[PDB]
Design an enzyme around this catalytic site. Structure first.
Site, short mmCIF file in Angstrom:
data_model
loop_
_atom_site.label_atom_id
_atom_site.label_comp_id
_atom_site.label_asym_id
_atom_site.label_seq_id
_atom_site.Cartn_x
_atom_site.Cartn_y
_atom_site.Cartn_z
N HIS A 13 15.61 -28.18 24.73
CA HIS A 13 14.83 -28.03 25.98
C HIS A 13 15.39 -26.93 26.89
O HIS A 13 14.68 -26.47 27.78
CB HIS A 13 14.66 -29.37 26.74
CG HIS A 13 15.81 -29.78 27.59
ND1 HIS A 13 16.72 -30.72 27.17
CD2 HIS A 13 16.15 -29.36 28.83
CE1 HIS A 13 17.61 -30.83 28.14
NE2 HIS A 13 17.29 -30.04 29.18
N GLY A 57 21.99 -29.37 34.64
CA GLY A 57 22.76 -28.17 34.43
C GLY A 57 23.85 -28.33 33.36
O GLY A 57 24.34 -27.37 32.79
N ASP A 90 16.38 -33.14 20.50
CA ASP A 90 16.70 -32.14 21.49
C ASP A 90 17.96 -31.35 21.15
O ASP A 90 19.03 -31.53 21.75
CB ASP A 90 16.80 -32.82 22.85
CG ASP A 90 16.87 -31.86 24.01
OD1 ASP A 90 16.54 -30.65 23.81
OD2 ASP A 90 17.20 -32.32 25.12
N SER A 115 23.14 -30.14 30.62
CA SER A 115 22.36 -30.25 29.37
C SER A 115 22.72 -29.18 28.40
O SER A 115 22.92 -28.02 28.78
CB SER A 115 20.87 -30.17 29.63
OG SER A 115 20.45 -31.20 30.50
N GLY A 116 22.81 -29.56 27.13
CA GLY A 116 23.14 -28.64 26.05
C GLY A 116 24.60 -28.56 25.75
O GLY A 116 25.00 -28.13 24.68
C1 4K6 Z 1 22.61 -36.87 32.81
C2 4K6 Z 1 21.55 -35.94 33.35
C3 4K6 Z 1 20.81 -36.31 34.47
C4 4K6 Z 1 19.74 -35.51 34.86
N1 4K6 Z 1 18.77 -35.65 35.84
C5 4K6 Z 1 17.92 -34.59 35.72
C6 4K6 Z 1 16.81 -34.34 36.67
C7 4K6 Z 1 15.81 -35.47 36.69
N2 4K6 Z 1 15.14 -35.64 35.41
C8 4K6 Z 1 14.34 -36.69 35.18
O1 4K6 Z 1 14.09 -37.51 36.05
C9 4K6 Z 1 13.74 -36.81 33.81
C10 4K6 Z 1 14.40 -36.47 32.63
C11 4K6 Z 1 13.87 -36.82 31.40
C12 4K6 Z 1 12.67 -37.51 31.33
N3 4K6 Z 1 12.16 -37.94 30.06
C13 4K6 Z 1 10.86 -37.95 29.65
N4 4K6 Z 1 10.75 -38.47 28.46
N5 4K6 Z 1 12.04 -38.83 28.06
C14 4K6 Z 1 12.84 -38.51 29.03
C15 4K6 Z 1 11.98 -37.81 32.49
C16 4K6 Z 1 12.51 -37.46 33.72
N6 4K6 Z 1 18.25 -33.79 34.72
C17 4K6 Z 1 19.41 -34.35 34.17
C18 4K6 Z 1 20.18 -33.94 33.09
C19 4K6 Z 1 21.26 -34.72 32.68
C20 4K6 Z 1 22.10 -34.24 31.53
#
Ligand code: 4K6
Ligand code: CL
Ligand code: NA
Lengths: 235, 57
Positions: free
Chosen positions: A41, A183, A89, A185-186
């Site tokens: 992603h 940030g 992913d 991620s990966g």
């Molecule tokens: C641990 C972590 C926390 C995070 N919060 C965010 C921002 C908020 N993201 C989200 O609220 C978000 C992330 C993934 C999904 N999703 C959909 N289908 N499967 C999963 C839905 C929503 N990015 C992150 C990256 C990481 C690595």
């Protein structure tokens, strides 16, 4: 990373940071001098990426950084962002010119499928990155690291409304306060085996970072080891 | 005593394989060599994977 500590120089020499439209937007790990492993992603065939290895403090030149251009992006063949941005992913990045391996720029080990899974089952790994240091907060300048325990599958499932498949795992703490974040991620989730670190997960996603009752969600690397080894072989 | 890969990983530092006569064979990842004690893993290249080599103060 929320609740982590500053890495010392060379403490996680397999870590890389990715730069693109925005700098330091995802992490990655060195597979070999020509290949990085990251989250699918984070990347997209056509969008220009640079990788920085040997990084520590993104705002200071420390004379260990090696910047490289990405010439090929290989998302896993089962990745399909139109269906699910977070399933399967994982992606590989080929570098234009090889990294020069040294004490600050060192690959992560990757065991076979059986042992990568055994190592995840040890239950404790290290995550690292330049992601947010608080939920919706500023990103790190100095690489952060954190030890995270493996969380039981049922706890992991009851923590989010989104689906967690058997090729993903959870890690973090019951009280929150210590987690990967946006940030990161990966980047790598590694397990230390008698002084040698092995890649056991890819940092993937989460919702409210470090919020009590929430956990970071990771890609199980064991499921992809054969694909990584085949695609990144230099001999 | 019983010596198998399921018991303390056969006392192998990295990888274990069951072999003949209640014995095991240890092995290591790329860049390491199995040591003369038959269990430990020693670097075989200048910058083996997964190792911290910079002084940590
Ligand atoms: C641990 C972590 C926390 C995070 N919060 C965010 C921002 C908020 N993201 C989200 O609220 C978000 C992330 C993934 C999904 N999703 C959909 N289908 N499967 C999963 C839905 C929503 N990015 C992150 C990256 C990481 C690595
Ligand atoms: Cl050997
Ligand atoms: Na720097």
């Amino acid at each position: 990373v929320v609740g982590g500590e500053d890495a010392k120089p060379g403490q996680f020499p397999w870590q890389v940071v990715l730069n693109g439209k925005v700098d330091a937007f995802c992490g990655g790990s060195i597979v070999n001098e020509k290949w990085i492993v990251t989250a699918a992603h984070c990347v997209e065939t056509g969008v220009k990426i640079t990788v920085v290895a040997g990084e520590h403090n993104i705002e200071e030149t420390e004379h260990t950084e090696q910047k490289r251009n990405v010439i090929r992006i290989i998302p896993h063949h089962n990745y399909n962002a139109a269906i699910n941005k977070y399933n399967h992913d994982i992606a590989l990045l080929e570098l234009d010119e090889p990294l020069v391996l040294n004490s600050y720029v060192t690959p992560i080990c990757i065991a076979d499928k059986e042992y990568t899974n055994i190592f995840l089952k040890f239950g404790s790994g290290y995550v690292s990155g330049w992601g947010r240091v608080f939920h919706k907060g500023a990103s790190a300048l100095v690489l952060q690291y954190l030890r995270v325990p493996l969380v039981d599958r049922a706890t992991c499932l009851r923590s989010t409304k989104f689906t967690i498949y058997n090729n993903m795992f959870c890690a973090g703490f019951h009280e929150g306060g210590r987690d990967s974040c946006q940030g990161d991620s990966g980047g790598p989730h590694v397990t230390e085996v008698e002084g040698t670190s092995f890649l056991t997960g890819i940092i993937s996603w989460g919702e409210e970072c470090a919020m009590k009752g929430k956990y970071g969600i990771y890609t199980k690397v064991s499921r992809y080891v054969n694909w990584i080894k085949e695609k990144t072989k230099l001999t | 005593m019983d010596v198998t890969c399921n018991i303390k990983n056969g006392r192998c530092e990295q990888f274990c394989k069951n072999s003949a006569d209640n014995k095991v064979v240890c092995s290591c990842t790329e860049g390491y060599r199995l040591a003369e004690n038959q269990k430990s893993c020693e670097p075989a290249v200048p910058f083996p994977c997964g190792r911290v080599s910079v002084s940590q103060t």
